[PDB]
Structure formats: structure tokens, C-alpha cells
Design a protein around this ligand. Structure first.
Ligand code: VCW
Ligand code: VCW
Lengths: 661, 665
């Protein structure tokens, strides 16, 4: 990075690219003080700042590699910048600053991607994105009835920026990435043509920069910095993970699914710990051991399924319910986050109370890894699980390490990911055991082998349906999470919103061209269509699993590529077509590796799909063999069973693709 | 008021009452800079500030009655304070400031009222109130389906703080009032226990203070400062103003209403200019002269009704539609507000586009007063009218006086009020012509003789129904508007929300204990029940008009009191019961003068009403004659016809009140 003087002040650049521009009249930094409200209701945050001071740091004193910044000439310095390689280090000289604003130079036509896993907008330009892990919202669009009803009944509607996995990292179309090293609340403000504004409710230790001649190279460098995932385990390629939460009846339903020719890698029973009925629906009993009442011979059933080549997966989250036998064990060992009066802090998760296992206490972290992940899950015979939640830390609780909950809230998913990874490592099962997370922050990449898109509504809505999965895959992919998947058919059934046959089949069509096909009965299983309950849906499902298994050699090559280069399995078109401006904001299509293009149908009643075909080569339609020229919009027939999928005519895997026809 | 120095800085007090407290660690003033967005859609504003600087003025140099304020010691001074009498004068020393924050000292249990005409919250403590005249919203509550559908279809839902009539004036339970002399956007922030914060998108010329031993005396002093209204004209006391927009059929409907025994002071036909029927509702043709197609005999019908003791009222607003014959007259004379390129600025009202008559051009203001108010209305025989709108000035339009639309937006209702008042004065009809306004700002009090509560939903909802009228009366009353009323049965019918018989009758019951009973067919007349269309509603309406006419001598005494002392007809209980803390936040009951207490039923299906009865005396239930002791909660039967109304047993008007029981029976 190059410091350079100008007429009125200075610039900081990486290569040809000016990043920071300071002058008294156009300052780069503003500093001040706020009093926030962050009220939590069931993982939804009502956040409002009261800004008491915001003051431009107009005056810069340069002393070599250090810049000292003050409000005005003669006034006491408030902030120090140090250029240290690819990083701007920041030191608060005024202890009272808890609000910092930083402007980075922007061009009018610049795109910015990342922000963690964004569900609504892939290109974030033109909008503001707070970065605070939470419930992402049901509906997530104030103009829909579902969002309105979620807001009225539970403050649960959310909005376009809410995510289980925020990250204060962006990739710019100017070919640099920026990372802020903080766990504090922060906002990316992309509303202004001439600058991006970062708000941080802290002075971060540093801001780190990555540059390169291609987007691919910057993503490689980001994945190396956050850490890469192991290759997918070989057993995943055997077919779909069937999600059932029907107790002993799960096994009879698995048999019916297999009898239709379905390729099955795994049975995933999140109710392995038993059910809890609430007004939300069929929830789980949060006590992390096999429930002999619900699954009386589970250890034997796991060994029986293993002899048929089918793994078994469960469910765990980092909270313990008050009415479970593990709660008093953990409370006696002092493993819970505490309230102001030193008592176990109880959080309302929705008509039941749970303690938060305090992962800042190393003994609590070690216990959860060894006793629950190790003994109760891996030694019991689980090959994997949903590793759920991580986003419910309220800011009014006290943690063993003495760090404010305001700073630990965003750190929680990364701590939770590490507990899972340590338990896996302790059994030598890294790269074989498959846990998947919906929550995240900086560093989850190093610990979690597979992200899932959390809870979608059971619909085709713009802001909470099928299409939001693709946005989540593309964003989280640029942040160095190579492997993304979703619940086939979505999760959230509320206010009479229920699945259709068409929704399940369209969702299956996308999932077959992702790393993992997994189903989910959802929050209200008996109110919603399941893959086994309609002959047409089941036959469609079986066929798509056969297509997934036939594509295994191609997916295995993409997983190898992800381990060697960091590039995600689901790629935005601009990553391989930099000179084509039409590819830069596309968020409902992805490149499945370099060689396939996928354009999922995300609306009810569509028989056709229009998409931009990139490049100067030919693309082959997977189902017909018909060739199409790159560099134009095209329309193809997409009846049920035949998603808009194309491969490069020059693909080394052409013989494999020709077979899936 | 006096400066007093302390260890670290200074205080400003009126008597025993600290108002401003400054120290470097706890400053009173913050200054900076913002870039606002204020996008208008049919009078609804989407407002968002981008605050670029907010900087505490930590350093004060005190020099007699004057203080100079800077960010820090040694830095260039930014603001000057001078105490001149009851006022703090402010001078910007830095030309770049367009944002000023001022903290005034508060106690944890302090109440604050005013803010103009507030429709949701009378006691504003605990919440923030932006002060920008607009459409007040349909539903005005983000948890209702009406608000949701209004937001989705037209960004039209609004919220608790939206009002046709904001005013940067408050009365404190600490017995002072504060007035900010500005027309800029401002916010009253009452969210903090220890201070009130005022935000202003300008440096105001001054902040004025009023202090007294009683709330009544502070209201008197505020009314003297803004200006008082004439007494109600004698003809109002003859009964209800019947609102009809049914053309020639209006007269046959008036006859059926009169045949039921209804006491009628006036026929109000807003469609006197013609009905613009759309798929969306029954709007008016915005060209301000009698329409010979709609009312072919209007001049003769006015003289016929006058011989029967019935006045005629119309409708006017300060905009002209492009397809009307007055538009070209005004365009040719240069009487319209202009866009950036100097062309006539057209504003979208929904189904039609209109020009804004530029009242900052004196010739345009004089033309409107002489040609429209004078010739087309008063000389045509109108005794009064709805003087509508005033809140739709967009901030991207250019005005003849060269003042930014950002400062003229809030001033518009007061300029519009003045045009109406000048036209009335030009015919010597001040105190006789009755025009009524929904929009307002500082000074509307001096010009407008009667406020109306604007458009309510046709419902009992908390944030847009019958109960919001009472909140509007109490707030606007403390601001020196002595006379308030509402459309009987509300206005806004959208999304299948339609009137019930019960809604009309409950609304009528309240209106009979207000200065003016007036009906309105609303935006969708044929979808909604009207007072003449149900035998039970009509009979109930006739009886309440007889009650109103019998109460005239009492209302006349309250109007005399309003002209002499400034006190509003509809008073908050705390104004006459200062030592009773239960009276301070009550906003669904009012004192109708000192001697009557009114507790309207504002919910469907209620047969009973509970209220706090104040004082150490006895109250008489109007309908039964049964006495009730002051100083406790009471529950009375409130069947249709018998609102919870009480009078003081010791009232000099007891003989009049005793008589209402028998009209009643
Ligand atoms: O019902 S439980 O809580 O026991 C289990 C579920 O927990 C998460 O969803 C819960 C919602 O976030 C509630 O607001 C997962 O996303 C889902 O797959 C899983 O079934
Ligand atoms: O239909 S018109 O617009 O020509 C006349 C009406 O104008 C106002 O209401 C209009 C709303 O504010 C629209 O948003 C008055 O309040 C109402 O009484 C009157 O009937």
C-alpha cells in the first residue's frame, strides 16, 4: 500500500487503486459517541442508535508510516493510522470514541459483493447493510402479508439486510477486497456515488486489503486468510440426505423413498433428541443425547443403516433447556452465561427457556466438544448433524472472559463452529463427519465444512423463497465458504403458507446442482407436503438424485478445486467473464464450477426461463443437446424435470454431461 | 429569565425553574450538517436525514446577558446566545450549520403537551415528534391492516407523529411553555428522563418562554402571542351543518333530514364546484367557482335557504387543476410556484395535476383573496367553507420570495389561512363568515376561526378513529385554537372499511358537545351509511342537534371566554384540576368549559363508560340527574343517545343543564 501527498492532504492506494482520500474539506474519518438500544425478542433485534457526537477528523499530522488525526489544528489527537503492509492499523487516542465512520473512495458504476451471506441483494451498491447476526426474518419484505403478520405477532418479519451470517468484508468491482477486523456492530453504507461509508461501534484493530489482476485471485487470497474447508466426504456422493422427524415411522418412510429408486447417502433425524410442541410447530427438545422414548433402539438402527450404505445425521445447538437433564449438570459446573446478579441467564426461545453455554469459558467449550459432540454424537455413530443457532446472544448478559456481550454477540457463531470442529478433530473425523451451520461471522470458514441457507419460507417469494438461496450461495462463496445448500422445499410454514408440489420439484432441480441434496419436514410437518407423499413429486425427486449421483465426478473435481484454489462450487458469472458487464449483478444464476451454468426457475407457473448466456463460445443445453452461442439473452423450455442447465461445449467432462440426457 | 454561573459552566432559569444547563462534560447545544431526502407522494413524505456532523459546543464565553459557544477552547465560535426578556435569541456565527440540537432540563415524571394538533399522543413524553405538515396517514399504526395496505398502495399509512398541523411549541407540567420561532423541519425528542432535545434543520432566530402560576395563565399568554379567534357567529348556534355532495339531489335529502326535526344551521356542498367522480372515489373539480352543470340554480337556492335561516357553505383549496379555466389566468399573470427550469410546477394529487398558487407573491395572494374568496365565494352568497389542504409544498419547487421551499413548506398553511382571512376582511365579514382548516403552523391561530380534525378513518381505531379527534382538540386547544370539530362519522373509507350506524351515532354524541356539528358524505358516499339513510341514525341525529341548540347559551359563554382569556372550548382535565395527577395524561375525556365533563365512547359494542371524575365537589349525570362524588373512577350506563356527560352541581348554568334531561326523555 502506497501513502501519497495531494494539494490539500493525502491518499492511500493498493496499486493503481486509490482507497482512502483525506483533506480538511473532504475528510476520510469521523469519530464520536452513541447510546444504542438492541432489544432481543426470540433472536430478532430491534436496533436503534442515538448519535450524540459525529465529528470529522479534519486535521492529519504525518510522521513516517503513522498519521495522527484530530477534529481541527491545535486540538487533542483522537485517532492514529499506521500503514503496515496490506493493513491500516487504528489506535483510539480518545477512550470516549465508540462510533467511527470511514469513507472509502468509489466510482459511480462500481459493484460491491460479500457482506457475509446476503439473502436479498448480491450487489450491495445503493443500499445500507448493518452486520449483526440474528434471525434473518420471515418474509423479509415490509410489502408482503407474511412479513406484516410476523412483525405483528413476533417482531419477526425482518428486512433485506437481516442475516444469520453477516461479515464485514466486501469485494469491489475495482478488483480489491476490504476486511474490517472487529466483532462490533458495523454498517456498510453504499448509498453514495463517490464513497462507501463504514460505520463501526468500536475502533477496529485494523482494516486489511487484498488486490489482484482477477476476482478469482482475490477470492483465493480471501479463502487463504479466513481458512479453507476440507473436501466433501466421499459418502455425500451416494445421494440425498433424507430429513424426517417422525420417530420410528421415519424408517418406514425412508423404505418407501428408497423403493421409488431414490439415491440416499444419509438419514437425518433432527428429532433424535425428541420433540417439543409449541405454537410455532413441532420443535425439538434441546437436550443433546439420544432420546430412548422417541427412538428406542437408535444405536442398532444406525448400524443397520450403515450396513445398507446409509449414514445417520442428527441435530445440536449451543443452548440447553431448563427442563432437560443436561441443564443442571452444566449449571453445577458453572458453564452458563450469567445475568447482572450472577444467576444463570435464561433466554426465551419461544415458549421455553434455555441457558447459553459460555464458550468464552474454556472448560465449557471443552465439555461441549468432548461430552456432546464426541461422546453423545460421534461415538454414538452420527456421521454428521445440523449445528444450529449461534445468533441469539443478548447484549445484557455477562461472559466468563469479561468481554462485553456487544463484542461477543457476532463472535458467537465462530466460537460455536470451533466447538463442533474440535469435537470432530478429537475423533480424527475431519473431512469425514459433516456438520452444517446457518450462522456465521469472520473465521467460521476455518471450522465449518458446509453452510446451509437457514430458514426460507415455503414459497417462491423474492425476499424469503427459493431465489434467496442463490444470493446466499454467491455472497458466502466470495467470502471463502466453498460449500452451500438449502432445505429442499424451504422450512417456514406460518399463517397458512404451505408447500406446493411445484415448489418442492423446482427446489429439488436446483439442489441436484449444489454440493448436498437434503430434505426437511419443516416446522409443521403434518400441514406441509413431504417428498414421500405425492407419487409425481417422489418420482421427480428420485430422478434428480440419479442426476446428482451421475454428476458426482464433476462435483468431486470442484471440491478438489475448492481445497487447492479456494473458489466456491457456486460461482457468480463475473468470476469467469470479467469483460462482460451484464454478468456483474446477476444473482438468480450461477456457474457450477467453470463448466456448467444453472438458472433455477424461482416462480410458480413458469414453463420457460430467460437468462444471460456469457462468453464467446458455445453452451450445450443439458436435456436437448441443442448448442447456444455465448454473449446474448436466451429463452429455453423448463418443464418439471428439465431445469435451465448448460455446459461449455469445450468441457473436458463433455462425455459425462452427454450421459445425463 | 437570568444567567447563573456554576463551577464548570452556566444555567438559564425562569424563577426557581432551571431550563438550560451547560458544562463542557454536559453541553446544552450541538451543531452540525446534514443532507436530507424528503420525497413527496400525494402529500405523504418519506423523510430520511444523513447526519454528516453533530458536534457538542463544549466551550462557553459568558459576557453579561450574551454567551458565545465553540466546539472547544481556542476554536472559532459557532453560535451566540443573548437573553432579551422572555426570549433566547440565537445567531449562527458559522454559515455551514444546518443542524442544531438544544437540550432543555427535564424531571423524570414531567408531562409535555402541544406540538400543534397531535392525533395519537396528547402527553408527548417518552416519544419523538417530527414537525412537518403532511397527510397525517390512513391508519397511522404499522400494526393495522389499513396502515399496511395504505403503505403498500400509496406510502400513505403514516405513523403516530404525522399531522396536518405541527407546531414547535410545548407546555411543560413544570409550568412553562417553549416556542421555537422557525418554519424549518424540527423534532421534539422526549425519549430521555433528564432532558428534552429539540432538533432544528436551521438556527432559529429565537426561542420564547412563558411562565405562570397556572396552566390557564400560560395558555392565555400563548393565545395572546399567536392571536385569538373571533367569537363563533350567531348563525352556527341554529344547529348542524349538513354535508352533502349529491348535486341537485342534496336539496331533497336536506328536506328529509329537516322533516325528522333536525336543527340545521347550514348546508355544506363541497361539490358546489362539480364532482370529479373516479373509480377510486368522489373527488371535486379544483376550479373555485359555482358549477352551473352540478348546481344550475345555486344562487337562487342560496337565497331560498337564507329565507329559511339556513346558510350555505362551500369548499376551496390553494391549488388550481390544469384542465380548469382559472389555471390559464393564474399562469399568464405569473401566480404559480415554478420548477428548476422556471416552468409552472405541477404537483400530482393522484387522479389529476395542479399548480400551486404562490402566496409569497403578494399579487398572487391578493388575487386569490379578491377574485376567489371575495367575488366567487362571499359575493356569491357563501357564509363559509372548508379551506382545505396547505400541506403539499414539495421542497424541489421555487417561490417568488426566493426563500427555500425547505423553509416555506411549514409556513404554507399560515399564508393560506391569511389569504382566507383577508378575503373575509375585504367584505367586512370577520366574525360572521366561518371557514375551517385542517392544516396549520405557527400563526394560523390569528387568521383561521375554526379547525377541523382532517380525515379520520370511518372506524373506532386507536390511531385513526373517533378517539383521535379528542387528542387533536386538546393539543390544538393548548396551542391557542379555541374551536375544534370533526366530520361526524369520519372521512376515509378504503380497503372495505365502511361506516356502521353505531359509529355515526357515537360520533354525533361527541360532536353535540363541540363548537360545530358538521356531517360529511366522505370519499366514497355510495359505499357508506349517511345520516339520512337509517331511521334510527336520523332520529338519534335530530335529538342530538336539539341538545346542541339547547346548549347554545353555554357554548356562547365559552366563546366569549375564548375571545377574552384565550382558553379553548375543549380543555384537558389538568387545566382546572392541577393538584390531581390522574388528570395529566387523560386524552379520551375533556372539560367542555369549566362546568361540563365529556367522556365519549370510542369503541364498538360498549354499553358502559369508565372515567376519572375530578375535584372534591359533586358531578351530575346529564341524562339521569344522579350525583357522583369527585376524586374517583366511575362507571355509567351509555346506551345510544346518552353519552357519559356530567356538569358541576354548583354550576351557574344548572337550570340549562337540567333542561337537556327532558329534551333527552
Ligand atoms: O424447532 S427447533 O428450534 O428445535 C429446530 C429448528 O431450528 C432452526 O429453526 C428455528 C427457527 O429459527 C425459529 O425461529 C433451524 O433453522 C431448523 O432447521 C430446525 O429444525
Ligand atoms: O376529494 S377531494 O380531494 O377533492 C376533497 C377532499 O379533500 C380533503 O381530503 C382529501 C384527502 O386528503 C386526499 O388524500 C378533505 O379533507 C376532504 O374533506 C374533502 O372531501
Amino acid at each position: 500500500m502506497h501513502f501519497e501527498t495531494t494539494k490539500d492532504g493525502f491518499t492511500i492506494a493498493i496499486g493503481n487503486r486509490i482507497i482512502l482520500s483525506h483533506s480538511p474539506d473532504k475528510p476520510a474519518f469521523f469519530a464520536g459517541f452513541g447510546e444504542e438500544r438492541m432489544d432481543m425478542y426470540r433472536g430478532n433485534f430491534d436496533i436503534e442508535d442515538y448519535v450524540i457526537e459525529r465529528t470529522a477528523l479534519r486535521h492529519a499530522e504525518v510522521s513516517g508510516d503513522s498519521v495522527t488525526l484530530s477534529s481541527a489544528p491545535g486540538q487533542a489527537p483522537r485517532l492514529r493510522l499506521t500503514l503496515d503492509g496490506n493493513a491500516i492499523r487504528l489506535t483510539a487516542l480518545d477512550e470516549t470514541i465508540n462510533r467511527l465512520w470511514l469513507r472509502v473512495v468509489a466510482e459511480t458504476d462500481e459493484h460491491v459483493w460479500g457482506g457475509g451471506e446476503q439473502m436479498s441483494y448480491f450487489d450491495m451498491r445503493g443500499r445500507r447493510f448493518p452486520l449483526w447476526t440474528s434471525e434473518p426474518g420471515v418474509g423479509r419484505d415490509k410489502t408482503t402479508e407474511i412479513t406484516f403478520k410476523s412483525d405483528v405477532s413476533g417482531k419477526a418479519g425482518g428486512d433485506y439486510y437481516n442475516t444469520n451470517y453477516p461479515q464485514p468484508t466486501w469485494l469491489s468491482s475495482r478488483k480489491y477486497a476490504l476486511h474490517v477486523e472487529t466483532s462490533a456492530y458495523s454498517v456498510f453504507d453504499f448509498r453514495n456515488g463517490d464513497f462507501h461509508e463504514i460505520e463501526i461501534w468500536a475502533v477496529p484493530e485494523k482494516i486489511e486489503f487484498f488486490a489482484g489482476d482477477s476476482f478469482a485471485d482475490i477470492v483465493s487470497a480471501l479463502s487463504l486468510h479466513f481458512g479453507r474447508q476440507p473436501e466433501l466426504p466421499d459418502w455425500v456422493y451416494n445421494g440425498a440426505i433424507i430429513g424426517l422427524k417422525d420417530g420410528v415411522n421415519s424408517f418406514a418412510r425412508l423404505e418407501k423413498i428408497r423403493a421409488a429408486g431414490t439415491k440416499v447417502s444419509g438419514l437425518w433425524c433432527e428429532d433424535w433428541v425428541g420433540l417439543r410442541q409449541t405454537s410455532f410447530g413441532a420443535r425439538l427438545f434441546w437436550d443433546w443425547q439420544a432420546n430412548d422414548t422417541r427412538y428406542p433402539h437408535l444405536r442398532q438402527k444406525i448400524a443397520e443403516l450403515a450396513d445398507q450404505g446409509i449414514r445417520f445425521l442428527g441435530y445440536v445447538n449451543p443452548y440447553l433447556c431448563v427442563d432437560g437433564p443436561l441443564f443442571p449438570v452444566a449449571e453445577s459446573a458453572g458453564y452458563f452465561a450469567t445475568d447482572v446478579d450472577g444467576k444463570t441467564a435464561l433466554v426465551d426461545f419461544g415458549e421455553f427457556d434455555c441457558g447459553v453455554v459460555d464458550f468464552t469459558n474454556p472448560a465449557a467449550a471443552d465439555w461441549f466438544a468432548a461430552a456432546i459432540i464426541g461422546k453423545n454424537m460421534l461415538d454414538f455413530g452420527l456421521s454428521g448433524w445440523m449445528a444450529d443457532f449461534g445468533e441469539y446472544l443478548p447484549i445484557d448478559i455477562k461472559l466468563s472472559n469479561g468481554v462485553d456481550a456487544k463484542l461477543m454477540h457476532n463472535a458467537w457463531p465462530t466460537l460455536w463452529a470451533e466447538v463442533n470442529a474440535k469435537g470432530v478433530e478429537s475423533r480424527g473425523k475431519t473431512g469425514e463427519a459433516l456438520f452444517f451451520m446457518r450462522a456465521g461471522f469472520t473465521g467460521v470458514q476455518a471450522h465449518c465444512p458446509l453452510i446451509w441457507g437457514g430458514n426460507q419460507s415455503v414459497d417462491f417469494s423474492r425476499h424469503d423463497g427459493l431465489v434467496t438461496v442463490i444470493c446466499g450461495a454467491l455472497s458466502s462463496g466470495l467470502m471463502g465458504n466453498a460449500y452451500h445448500h438449502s432445505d429442499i422445499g424451504g422450512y417456514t410454514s406460518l399463517f397458512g403458507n404451505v408447500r406446493t408440489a411445484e415448489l418442492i420439484m423446482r427446489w429439488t432441480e436446483m439442489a441436484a446442482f449444489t454440493p448436498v441434496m437434503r430434505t426437511h419436514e419443516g416446522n409443521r410437518p403434518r400441514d406441509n407436503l413431504q417428498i414421500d407423499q405425492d407419487e409425481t413429486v417422489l418420482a421427480h425427486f428420485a430422478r434428480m438424485t440419479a442426476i446428482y449421483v451421475a454428476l458426482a465426478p464433476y462435483l468431486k473435481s470442484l471440491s478438489a478445486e475448492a481445497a487447492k484454489t479456494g473458489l466456491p462450487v457456486q460461482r457468480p458469472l463475473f468470476l469467469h467473464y470479467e469483460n462482460e458487464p451484464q454478468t456483474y449483478a446477476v444473482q438468480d444464476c450461477y456457474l457450477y464450477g467453470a463448466d456448467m451454468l444453472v438458472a433455477p426457475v424461482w416462480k410458480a407457473g413458469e414453463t420457460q426461463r430467460s437468462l444471460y448466456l456469457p462468453g464467446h463460445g458455445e453452451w450445450v443445453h443439458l436435456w436437448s443437446g441443442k448448442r447456444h452461442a455465448g454473449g446474448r439473452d436466451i429463452t429455453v423450455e423448463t418443464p418439471l424435470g428439465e431445469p435451465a442447465v448448460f455446459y461449455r461445449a469445450d468441457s473436458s467432462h463433455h462425455r459425462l454431461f452427454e450421459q445425463l440426457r
